[PDB]
Design an enzyme around this catalytic site. Structure first.
Site, PDB file in Angstrom:
ATOM      1  N   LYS A   8       0.824  -1.197   0.000  1.00 53.00           N
ATOM      2  CA  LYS A   8       0.000   0.000   0.000  1.00 53.00           C
ATOM      3  C   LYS A   8       0.866   1.258   0.000  1.00 53.00           C
ATOM      4  CE  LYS A   8      -4.383  -1.590   1.872  1.00 53.00           C
ATOM      5  NZ  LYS A   8      -4.082  -2.953   2.378  1.00 53.00           N
ATOM      6  N   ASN A  13      -2.890  -0.614   6.951  1.00 54.88           N
ATOM      7  CA  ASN A  13      -2.244  -1.865   7.320  1.00 54.88           C
ATOM      8  C   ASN A  13      -1.027  -2.193   6.461  1.00 54.88           C
ATOM      9  OD1 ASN A  13      -3.366  -2.654   4.905  1.00 54.88           O
ATOM     10  ND2 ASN A  13      -4.793  -4.141   5.789  1.00 54.88           N
ATOM     11  N   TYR A  72     -12.215  -2.341  -5.590  1.00 52.92           N
ATOM     12  CA  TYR A  72     -12.899  -2.617  -4.329  1.00 52.92           C
ATOM     13  C   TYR A  72     -14.412  -2.689  -4.547  1.00 52.92           C
ATOM     14  CZ  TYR A  72      -8.752  -2.209  -1.392  1.00 52.92           C
ATOM     15  OH  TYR A  72      -7.537  -2.419  -0.786  1.00 52.92           O
ATOM     16  N   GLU A 125      -8.231 -11.365  -9.062  1.00 50.76           N
ATOM     17  CA  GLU A 125      -7.444 -10.153  -8.905  1.00 50.76           C
ATOM     18  C   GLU A 125      -6.163 -10.203  -9.730  1.00 50.76           C
ATOM     19  OE1 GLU A 125      -8.858  -7.742  -7.641  1.00 50.76           O
ATOM     20  OE2 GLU A 125      -7.211  -6.609  -8.523  1.00 50.76           O
TER      21      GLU A 125
END
Lengths: 249, 51, 213, 51, 201
Positions: E9, E115, E49, E129
């Site tokens: 991320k 996270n 998402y 994905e």
């Protein structure tokens, strides 16, 4: 073995032949070569040479390429040339069309410092100085680009790539162990196929280092160290051509 | 060009004109490879190159 | 035979590289109810590198459905969003840089960040005329026909003349604009020029290089 | 204008250090000489002496 | 030998810890099949998402995921999915520090949503994905190559356009040579097809 000639090794081995650059410019080079290599998309940007001038502001010229293909029976590199007065900030050298490429070869002389200089020919033709500089660099690169034979190889998709298993050239004093960079790897074209008296080879067999000097272009030097397998080439002095080779030899 | 070049051209040791201790010399345009250098009271002449 | 025409806005980077857009359509089907009922369809439009502005993508069979007539196609017309730097003119870009006068005369290097993630430094090759231009070949948008060749970036030069000049500055400019050719200069002229250059580039009391306050 | 300051001959110092075989080396020495010029020249950071 | 999807991320990339994360990933037996550094746009992240559509945390989740570049990776191992869930640790960093102090969340995470890593859940989601970010990466030759599924695939998608093309060709009947007919049918398929539009300039 090697994949790109150093700047430090080249400047060290070719110091005796007068191919040296200023120390402050050397430090500026050490810092500002990667910056230009990353700003432009290039993956191999070395120092090509240093051309003199009527001022003290010589032209340092660097050369870099992304792709190197095999087109129409010749290994062609999509080269890009950059110039600077000091090793800090580089500018680019745009290629020139054929009409100017023929109107720039008649302007014999020593280039001035400001790259905004216009030469005049004959009606009057106004030519920029950067065009003349690019013409001279192109001519010298066409006549002089020297690499050891079999140092390159062809892969799938016909790209010339470094020969990672190159074991050096036997008899590094014979001109048959060197070739133009734009000769295809399979072809048996070498510097021997050029004019006989154009190239001079001095080979220190004890320290194992060979020097090839161009006599048609007097300021082009190339070194090849066999024990460490490092080859490099530089050009110092202006880019004028030695027409009367027959009389000098 | 219609202006004949001079026989001697300057040569510098730095791109900046404010460096404190810089050598500065001349270079022969007629005989290429001949240089002269001066730093304070220590000066030199030398010719390297083809004759 | 009516069709629904919709602008499709793309950035120059997308058209340069070749995007793959997913657009939404609100389609109406007429029923017995007084008001209509509509649904959102998703359409994948694949713009190729450097398609000319005004390209029409027609989806046949998509559009408001009257009870009797099969719906006509829906048209998407490609248009580019404004860019901070470049404006495309056919197959090549245009960059309009405002230039100082001394950059025009003496010559400097313009700095341009291309659509591709490469920087570019282009020297000024001569005295830039007012309303003149510069051309960097191979630095424009890709050719829609061949996916390798590109146009040529065009710098359009608009000089930025100084707003104020003193009388001594004008004297220096007149002395610069009427200096005799170097083969016509006296020895006094050469000595004076050498003295002035050594004074203007004086390392501690000369104004050749100063630091901004 | 650049500030007037009092430094030594840093390039000569680098030469001496390389002659003796101690110190940081000549290439770093050129950078130190230029960074000390950067420090001393600053009009805002008015220095009488840099070393 | 299976493989899973995993993305670093923007928070662990803004802090320059991406390379250490890759080294740790490789030290535990994984093998990075393919990696790519990329910055999602708002639409691409919203499509990414899709499962948490209209959730309460969706605005901040999609706003954080498009704040900087991320890294996308495919990791291969016999137990890749479960092993990556275990190594990646508990989903809450504050819970992670108490429960498993030597885990990627504890070491690099800072917040419930930051996270610092994202992994897959189940093999179907993982394959989906991987196809989402690596359209050309091959895989799964068992579920796709299945006579019932293959017949359904050809009938549902490829067959509707092909039947019209073979009819037009039978009507036109071009030269009896193979190449002309093949070129004609290929041009027809690439000219009028259901999902793609027609390009005019």
């Amino acid at each position: 073995v090697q994949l790109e000639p150093n700047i430090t090794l080249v400047l060290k081995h070719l110091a005796s032949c007068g191919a040296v650059v200023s120390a402050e410019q050397q430090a500026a080079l050490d810092h500002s070569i990667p910056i230009k290599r990353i700003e432009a998309g290039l993956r191999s940007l070395t120092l090509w040479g240093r051309l003199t001038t009527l001022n003290g502001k010589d032209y340092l010229v660097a050369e870099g390429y992304n792709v190197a293909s095999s087109k129409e029976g010749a290994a062609v590199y999509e080269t890009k040339y950059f110039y600077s007065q000091d090793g800090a900030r580089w500018s680019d050298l745009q290629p020139v069309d054929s009409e100017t490429a023929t109107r720039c070869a008649r302007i014999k002389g020593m280039l001035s410092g400001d790259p905004a200089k216009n030469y005049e020919l004959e009606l009057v033709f106004q030519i920029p100085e950067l065009a003349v500089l690019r013409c001279r660099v192109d001519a010298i690169a066409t006549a002089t680009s020297v690499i050891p034979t079999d140092s390159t190889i062809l892969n799938a998709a016909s790209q010339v790539v470094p020969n990672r298993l190159f074991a050096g050239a036997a008899y590094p004093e014979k001109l048959e162990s060197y070739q133009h960079r734009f000769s295809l790897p399979g072809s048996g074209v070498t510097l021997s196929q050029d004019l006989r008296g154009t190239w001079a080879v001095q080979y220190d067999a004890f320290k194992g280092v060979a020097q090839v000097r161009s006599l048609l272009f007097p300021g082009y030097f190339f070194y090849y160290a066999a024990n460490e397998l490092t080859w490099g080439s530089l050009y110092v002095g202006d880019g004028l051509r030695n027409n009367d080779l027959i009389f000098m030899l | 060009d219609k202006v004949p070049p001079p026989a001697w051209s300057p040569v510098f040791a730095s791109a900046s004109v404010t460096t404190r201790n810089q050598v500065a010399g001349v270079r022969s345009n007629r005989w290429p490879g001949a240089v002269c250098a001066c730093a304070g009271r220590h000066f030199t002449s030398m010719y390297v190159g083809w004759g | 035979g009516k069709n629904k025409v919709y602008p499709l806005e793309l950035t120059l980077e997308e058209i340069f590289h070749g995007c793959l857009k997913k657009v939404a359509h609100k389609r109406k089907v007429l029923l017995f109810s007084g008001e209509y009922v509509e649904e959102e369809r998703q359409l994948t439009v694949d713009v190729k590198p450097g398609l000319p502005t005004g390209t029409r993508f027609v989806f046949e069979g998509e559009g408001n459905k009257t009870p009797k007539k099969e719906p006509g196609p829906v048209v998407f017309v490609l248009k580019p969003k404004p860019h901070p730097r470049f404006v495309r003119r056919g197959s090549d870009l245009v960059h309009k840089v405002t230039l100082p006068l001394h950059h025009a005369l003496i010559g400097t290097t313009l700095d341009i960040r291309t659509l591709d993630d490469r920087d570019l430094k282009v020297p000024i090759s001569d005295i830039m005329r007012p309303g003149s231009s510069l051309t960097v070949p191979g630095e424009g948008m890709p050719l829609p026909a061949t996916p390798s060749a590109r146009g040529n970036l065009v710098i359009e030069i608009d000089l930025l003349f100084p707003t104020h000049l003193t009388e001594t500055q004008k004297m220096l400019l007149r002395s610069a604009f009427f200096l005799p050719p170097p083969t016509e200069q006296n020895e006094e002229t050469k000595k004076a020029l050498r003295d002035y250059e050594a004074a203007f580039k004086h390392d501690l009391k000369g104004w050749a290089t100063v630091f901004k306050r | 204008p650049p500030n007037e300051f009092e430094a030594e001959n840093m390039l000569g110092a680098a030469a001496v250090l390389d002659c003796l075989g101690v110190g940081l080396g000549r290439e770093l020495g050129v950078n130190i000489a230029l960074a000390a010029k950067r420090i001393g020249e600053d009009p805002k950071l008015a220095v009488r002496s840099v070393r | 030998l299976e493989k899973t999807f995993a993305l670093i991320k923007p928070d662990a990339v803004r802090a320059g810890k991406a390379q250490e994360i890759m080294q740790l990933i490789e030290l535990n037996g994984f093998t990075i099949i393919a990696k790519q550094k990329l910055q999602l746009t708002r639409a691409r992240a919203e499509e990414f998402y899709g499962e948490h559509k209209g959730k309460e945390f969706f605005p901040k989740l999609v706003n954080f995921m498009t704040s900087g570049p991320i890294w996308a990776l495919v990791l291969a191992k016999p137990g890749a999915i479960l092993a990556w869930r275990a190594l990646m640790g508990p989903t809450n960093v504050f819970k992670a520090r108490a429960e498993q102090p030597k885990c990627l969340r504890a070491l690099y995470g800072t917040d419930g949503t930051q996270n610092a890593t994202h992994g897959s859940d189940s093999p179907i989601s993982a394959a989906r994905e991987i196809k989402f970010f690596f359209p050309t990466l091959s895989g799964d030759p068992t579920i796709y190559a299945e006579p019932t599924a293959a017949a359904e695939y050809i009938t549902k998608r490829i067959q509707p356009a092909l039947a019209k093309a073979l009819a037009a060709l039978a009507r036109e009947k071009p030269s009896a040579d193979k190449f002309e007919a093949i070129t004609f049918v290929a041009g027809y398929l690439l000219q009028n097809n259901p999902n793609k539009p027609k390009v005019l300039m």
